[PDB]
Design a protein around this ligand. Structure first.
Ligand code: BCL
Ligand code: BPH
Ligand code: V7N
Ligand code: V7N
Ligand code: V7N
Ligand code: V7N
Ligand code: V7N
Ligand code: V7N
Ligand code: V7N
Ligand code: V7N
Ligand code: V7N
Ligand code: CRT
Ligand code: LMT
Ligand code: FE
Lengths: 99, 39, 49, 71, 335, 60, 40, 49, 40, 49, 39, 40, 39, 71, 49, 39, 60, 39, 49, 40, 60, 39
């Protein structure tokens, strides 16, 4: 696992889908939202570049990559909404919102 | 995604399995003690 | 005093208690067979010379 | 004094602590098990007066040596 | 500072190399695949192999050699599969008894040994041919088969030196600890191999091979961030990674190689390890029988004060005999 | 106390625990099997009075 | 999740009944055991 | 009292119960054959001298 | 999901009946055993 | 009582029962031959002296 | 798996096979008892 | 990959039953081994 | 990092766990000392 | 308890389980086969009273003062 | 005095107290059996002559 | 965690259990003292 | 329970099975051949009363 | 992978080959037993 | 009673039965030749001194 | 898809016939064997 | 049963079968040639009543 | 990948070659047994 790495052996795993409040999962989620939105931005820039230069088999892959980047982002947005709902109902949670 | 309900449910099994495991090991030790005491 | 059961699951309670009783009963018998001379006197009654 | 923890992830603290205790416990047990006095798997049934005690002195005959002669 | 010791980001390609460069006769065996573990340390592709006629025959001849050795080892523990694994490093297939000289020995007393040695030797020669043909098919120089010929030369002296002294008993037993027992006893029989000057030279090149690969490995990793591991392009189109590599060693020890010529230093140090080795083996027991006394004659041996002094009657008393045959009877001593 | 399963992935702690118990159990069984007192495969049918004991102090 | 108070009250009644039953049977067992081999 | 079975799977109950009975019955017969000296007296009845 | 209340209610009736059947057979077994080789 | 079979497969139930009976019968006979001294008396009757 | 009507059919044969097997075994034990009684 | 709670409940029925059946076989094997050559 | 409230709540568990563990170890040494004292 | 299979891929579980049981079974057989008491391939036909037993603690004096074997 | 329990959890408290009582009682009995020579006198009473 | 009114209800039972446990143990020691006095 | 073959690719299982059975069969045959009692190549023509038996306990 | 029909068809052969293998193994064991019993 | 065969393949059934019958017959003959002293008496009838 | 009910019902008739034919031949064999060398 | 060759490539199976059988045949001949009873190159002409058996002569 | 009818053709050869080999090996054992029986 790329994010928790070796610590996954000891069962720290802050990527897993979470619906109770957890400041550790909320921290991971806020970090990964920013990275994946930048990654979606880069993916659609790369599509625009390769469409402009017109190379057909590359346009196909750039669109396929962009769709995957959007899907991976959408998972983190779903995680963000779960945690933000749990934040509002849980005492001592963050005051700044997730997502 | 995981709720606190699921955590409380899992914790009950974890405590129960731990206790059952400790029960069996306690009987095993008393059998071994009855057979050949180590003190 | 029943309120101690609230939020527990009955199968968790019955398995925990069931484990404890099985362990206690086995330990008590293994102990008792060493203190009372039984089944040793039963065995000696029907033993072959 | 609790402010010590603000620097640390508590999950990682616990994993660090358990690993320390597990190593320390096994070291102390294997040291004792390798001793004569506390080799309890073989000699645990000995009473405290019967258990081994390290020698308050060695002894020899005068012509004996544990080591061979040599410069 | 990044050490470049392992690769945090690998890339896959869905079509692949592993389909060879244009190669003509023979066949590419298997389909290429990636190992993520191989990709951590080196290039990830684990993939297709070429044999041709010489590679196929080499594997057949070599497999038979391996079977003969293993079956004899397994027979030597009475076919016990537990003792076969438990005792494996002490087991051997052992050369013939000395009294046969070069004559064919009985099957269970070295006949299987000479058979395994023959098929292993043929298998090694067929593998050399397989490598030679492959280097030419890929349109490469012949450096690798001649480097491998140096290893084969040393190996062959474990046949020729027994031939020259006149007995197959002197050959190396097939077995993990048993061949190390032979290695020690060879030095004992011939009066301490440290004083064999070609053995001393062979060590000088074995150590030098480690010195060079440590230096060269480290050097290229130290400039790898500047593209220094693209060694062919640094040879044809010298970059700053090559220049810095030359200047480091020049400024350190006063002289330097080039990105090409360091590989010649590497090639000759490795090749001379086994070449000087083989010469030393061939000289042993044929020209010199006691290397320490050859050292005394040629002034190699440092003097030490005497640890004991013999009287003349002790000099006659303490001579032994040369070792003979074992007693072929179980004497009764009763009268 | 059940809140630790939000801090730690149950899926991964369970695997680690099963592995830890297996190793510790095998270690203790082989330590005993290698002893004199508890070489139970050879001597398990001896009574407790008959089983070996590690040598005592000479008390002198 | 888990038992409500109304379930807990119901569950408690059986738990008490079973516990008292088990203790009664064990009380007979000890009376028989004492009649057979007194231990004090 | 029947409420204890709610949420269970009856095949798992019968599997568990049947497995407990087999092991308990086997242990009891090894034990009883020991104490009561039977079938040892059966074997001696029909043994050839 | 798992077994419903009404399934459990009739399962219990058979489980009780089976258990009593077993205990009856075991009672005859012990009565025959006691006749043959009494153990107290 | 037939509802215990609901959800089961006849071919599993028959396979499991048949396997049990094969094992149990062979265990019982090999035990019984040890206790009853038969076929040993049969073999002794037709043995050549 | 089996429906409630299939289970009703299957159970009828199971009862029949079981009782028939126990009848045959009872005759076997009567013969065995008359031949070499074990108590 | 998917794995629904009914699939898990169906799998648990086989996994438990297979496990217990194996333990039953092993129990008979120990019954045979003990009657041949007890280890205590 | 974490709010002061959480570091305090955590410190309460760490102190209590440490002392509970040291109590159990104290009994273990009491038992060991009863069986074979080392001074 | 069935939800453990929601948590783990059953294809991974069963393969790990069968591999564990195979290795454990092999180990226990080979441990027994190397013992004297349970060297069943050589000595399996011995009765339980004739099977080997690992030697006791000594005769309680644990001391030597013998008499010869008869000539 | 009840105000000590607020902020605690009943099941944790009862687990800690229950584990204490199990351990203390077991230590006390095994100690007491050593000192009072019981059940050793019980064992000698029914032992084989 | 537990509230002030829940703690009040908890405390009543906890005292009841503690006093009952001590009472039974008091009887046990009176019996033990009669059977084998230890001073 | 043929649906076992849906969760496990039988192409993989049959290769794993045949590999296991082959190795285990050979291990058992060589364990027997290595023993005194079942060294059937040298001693297979001996009768069951003539075949070796491993040593008993010394009092036996 | 397989359709369920393929699994049904495959399983019948797999059961048959297993049973055939066990039959031959059982005869092999009883031949070996009659030649040289191991218990 | 026939309905047990439904969903089976008759080639599977006849293979399984045929294997069992070959097995059981051979085991019974290997066993019977041990107990009944036959063909051992046949071999003695025609053996050369 | 395997054997239908009508196939199964036809198959069953041969299976019964063959089984009884086998039992008949075996009964003859046992009668002959008993008269040759009785075993009880 | 022929569908086994759909599941596995017969071009792979036949090479594996040939390799397995050749090695097994080689092993069995080596084991026999290594024995005393079946040392057939040296003793194949003996005739069965005077071929070796793995037993010790009576009365030594 | 073969067609079903093509696999059926290969299976015919493969079974026949296997049984032919077993037949030859059976006669080899008949000769070996006549020369020097191993039981
Ligand atoms: C899906 C069906 C259920 C099941 C349903 C029943 C029923 C119904 C009965 C039993 C009974 C028994 N079961 Mg159950 N049992 C199951 C699983 C098991 C397992 C296990 C490892 O999973 C074991 C060890 C047992 C063991 C046992 C015995 C203790 C007991 C006596 C019969 C016997 O010896 O069967 C040994 C069999 C096996 C080891 C495997 C096959 C299991 C078959 C299905 C058992 C029942 C069939 C048998 C012919 C009896 C039916 C009588 C009815 C009047 C028709 N069962 C499965 C999960 N079991 C009987 C009992 O309680 O008698 C007092 C009984 O009436
Ligand atoms: C310059 C001196 C050093 C040196 C160099 C060197 N060695 C070399 C080379 C070079 C340059 C090669 O190119 C060559 C090589 O191939 O390297 C990978 C080789 C080699 N150095 C080797 C070993 C080696 N080198 C050693 C040492 C040295 N090598 C020196 C230090 C040592 C030592 C220190 O003891 C060893 C053991 C080999 C790995 C390799 C030569 C391989 C070879 O000849 O193999 C012959 C084949 C066999 C033994 C048979 C294998 C049998 C299979 C396992 C059977 C599988 C079944 C088979 C498929 C059945 C057939 C069916 C058919 C129908 C297909
Ligand atoms: C040579 O001698 C030397 C070695 C030197 C001497 C020294 C030795 C030393 C120092 C030893 C130390 C030992 C030690 C120290 O702590 C030992 C500690 C041991 C421990 C803690 C054991 C704990 C065991 C717990 C178990 C078994 C739990 C099982 C739980 C189960 C089964 C339930 C799982 C959940 C389910 C089923 C529900 C899923 C639901 C889900 C998912 C849902 O509902 O969603
Ligand atoms: C020899 O030396 C040493 C060993 C040292 C000597 C000393 C030993 C010592 C110190 C021993 C101490 C022992 C001890 C200490 O406490 C012993 C305590 C024992 C106890 C507590 C026994 C209790 C048993 C209770 C039972 C059997 C209950 C059964 C309940 C049943 C059948 C009902 C189930 C149905 C229900 C619930 C309804 C569900 C409804 C639902 C779900 C709904 O309605 O929804
Ligand atoms: C020697 O020294 C030591 C060892 C120390 C000595 C001491 C030993 C000790 C302490 C022993 C203790 C033993 C013990 C203690 O409790 C033993 C307890 C034993 C018990 C509980 C036995 C219970 C048996 C129950 C049976 C057979 C039930 C069968 C039910 C059947 C057949 C009906 C099936 C159908 C159903 C259910 C409904 C279908 C579904 C429907 C309708 C639907 O789904 O709708
Ligand atoms: C020596 O010391 C120790 C070992 C210790 C001593 C002790 C030993 C002990 C304890 C032994 C055993 C005890 C025991 C306990 O219960 C033994 C239990 C035995 C039992 C239960 C035997 C059961 C037999 C049942 C049979 C034969 C059923 C046959 C059914 C048939 C033929 C019908 C088939 C057709 C079908 C189904 C089609 C249906 C229609 C369908 C599907 C449709 O139409 O769709
Ligand atoms: C001698 O010295 C030393 C060696 C040191 C001493 C030893 C020491 C130690 C430490 C020993 C430890 C032992 C141990 C510890 O836990 C042992 C634990 C053992 C265990 C748990 C065994 C469990 C076995 C379970 C099995 C076999 C399950 C089989 C499942 C089957 C058959 C089901 C088939 C159907 C399926 C899968 C469903 C398909 C899907 C379908 C149909 C669908 O989807 O429809
Ligand atoms: C040669 O000499 C030789 C032989 C070697 C000899 C000499 C040896 C020497 C020098 C030894 C030195 C030893 C030493 C020196 O310091 C030893 C020091 C040891 C120490 C510090 C031990 C400390 C232990 C602390 C523990 C156990 C704490 C546990 C905490 C727990 C349990 C709380 C968990 C709660 C959580 C997670 C929150 C959940 C609630 C939640 C989430 C909620 O409510 O939400
Ligand atoms: C031999 O040498 C050495 C060893 C040295 C000798 C010396 C030994 C020494 C020094 C020993 C000291 C021992 C000791 C020291 O104090 C011993 C102290 C013992 C104590 C404290 C016993 C207390 C027992 C209390 C009990 C049983 C409570 C039971 C409570 C119950 C049943 C209620 C449960 C339900 C609840 C709560 C829910 C209510 C509703 C709720 C919450 C709701 O409705 O919400
Ligand atoms: C020294 O002694 C020590 C070693 C120490 C002692 C210890 C020993 C131990 C621990 C032993 C353990 C043994 C063991 C388990 O562990 C043993 C397990 C044995 C087992 C399970 C054997 C199973 C064999 C099964 C076979 C052969 C099946 C063959 C099937 C065939 C041929 C049909 C194939 C399919 C076809 C033709 C249809 C294609 C259709 C298709 C494709 C379609 O229709 O699509
Ligand atoms: C020595 O000590 C120990 C060993 C211990 C002693 C104890 C031994 C024991 C316990 C023995 C027990 C033995 C036993 C127990 O049951 C034995 C049971 C044996 C049995 C069941 C034999 C049954 C044989 C059946 C046969 C031959 C059937 C042949 C059928 C044929 C030819 C018909 C072919 C045509 C068909 C099918 C139609 C296709 C049409 C189609 C498809 C269409 O039309 O569609
Ligand atoms: C069934 O398959 C099994 C399980 C048995 C397979 C397993 C096999 C195993 C486990 C094999 C293990 C092998 C091991 C461990 C081998 C170890 C080998 C080692 C360490 C060897 C080391 C040195 C050996 C040397 C140097 C040998 C050199 C031999 C030479 C040069 C021989 C030359 C012989 C010639 C040229 C013979 C010519 C034939 C004539 C007729 C001319 O005779 C002179
Ligand atoms: C390694 C030693 C092998 C020894 C082999 C001994 C000889 C064995 C071959 C016997 C020849 C007759 O055997 C028979 O041959 C025919 C072709 O003629 C094969 O026929 C096969 O192919 C034909 C088409 O060519 C198909 O229509 C047929 O369905 C199929 O079975 C049979 O499957 C085989 O049973
Ligand atoms: Fe380089």
């Amino acid at each position: 696992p790329v994010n928790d790495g070796i610590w996954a052996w000891y069962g720290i795993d802050d990527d897993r889908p979470m619906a109770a409040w957890s400041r550790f999962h909320a921290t991971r989620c806020v970090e990964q939202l920013a990275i994946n939105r930048a990654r979606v931005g880069a993916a659609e820039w790369a599509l625009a570049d390769v469409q402009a230069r017109g190379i057909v088999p590359c346009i196909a892959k750039a669109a396929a990559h962009l769709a995957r980047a959007r899907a991976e982002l959408a998972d983190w947005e779903a995680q963000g909404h779960r945690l933000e709902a749990a934040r509002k109902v849980t005492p001592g949670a963050w005051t700044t919102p997730v997502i | 995604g995981m709720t606190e309900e699921e955590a409380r449910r899992f914790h009950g099994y974890m405590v129960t399995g731990t206790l059952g495991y400790v029960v069996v090991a306690s009987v095993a030790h008393f059998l071994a003690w009855s057979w050949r005491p180590w003190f | 005093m029943h309120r101690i059961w609230m939020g527990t699951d009955p199968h968790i309670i019955m398995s925990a208690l069931g484990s404890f009783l099985v362990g206690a009963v086995l330990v008590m018998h293994i102990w008792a067979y060493g203190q009372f001379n039984w089944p040793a006197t039963l065995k000696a009654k029907y033993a072959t010379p | 004094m609790h402010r010590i923890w603000l620097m640390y992830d508590p999950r990682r603290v616990m994993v660090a602590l358990v690993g320390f205790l597990a190593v320390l416990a096994l070291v102390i047990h294997f040291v004792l098990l390798s001793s004569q006095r506390y080799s309890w798997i073989e000699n645990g049934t000995l009473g405290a007066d019967q258990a081994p005690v390290g020698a308050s002195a060695p002894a020899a005959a005068a012509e004996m040596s544990p080591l061979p002669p040599g410069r | 500072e990044y050490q470049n010791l392992f690769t945090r980001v690998q890339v896959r390609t869905v079509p692949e190399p592993g389909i060879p460069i244009d190669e003509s006769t023979g066949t590419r065996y298997g389909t290429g695949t990636f190992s993520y573990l191989a990709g951590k340390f080196g290039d990830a592709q684990i993939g297709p192999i070429y044999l041709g006629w010489a590679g196929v025959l080499s594997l057949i001849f070599g497999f038979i050699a391996i079977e003969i050795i293993g079956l004899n080892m397994w027979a030597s523990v009475g076919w016990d599969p537990v003792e076969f694994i438990r005792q494996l490093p002490w087991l051997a297939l052992e050369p013939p008894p000395p009294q046969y000289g070069l004559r064919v020995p009985p099957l269970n007393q070295g006949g299987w040994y000479l058979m395994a040695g023959f098929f292993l030797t043929v298998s090694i020669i067929l593998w050399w041919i397989r490598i030679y043909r492959r280097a030419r098919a890929l349109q490469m120089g012949s450096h690798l088969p001649w480097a491998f010929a140096s290893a084969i030369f040393l190996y062959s002296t474990f046949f020729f030196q027994p031939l020259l002294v006149g007995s197959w008993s002197e050959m190396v037993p097939f077995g993990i600890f048993p061949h190390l027992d032979w290695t020690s006893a060879f030095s004992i029989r011939y009066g301490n191999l440290y004083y064999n000057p070609f053995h001393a030279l062979s060590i000088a090149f074995l150590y030098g091979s480690a010195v060079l690969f440590a230096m060269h490995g480290a050097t290229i990793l130290a400039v790898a961030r500047m593209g220094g591991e693209r060694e062919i392009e640094q040879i044809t189109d010298r970059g700053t990674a090559a220049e810095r590599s030359m200047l480091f060693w020049r400024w350190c020890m006063g002289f330097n190689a080039t990105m090409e010529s360091i590989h010649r230093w590497a090639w000759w140090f490795a090749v001379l390890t086994t070449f000087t080795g083989g010469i030393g083996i061939l000289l042993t027991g044929t020209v010199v029988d006691n290397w320490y006394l050859w050292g005394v004659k040629h002034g190699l041996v440092a003097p030490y004060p005497a640890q004991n002094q013999l009287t003349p009657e002790q000099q006659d008393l303490l001579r032994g005999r040369y070792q003979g045959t074992a007693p072929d009877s179980f004497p009764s001593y009763v009268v």
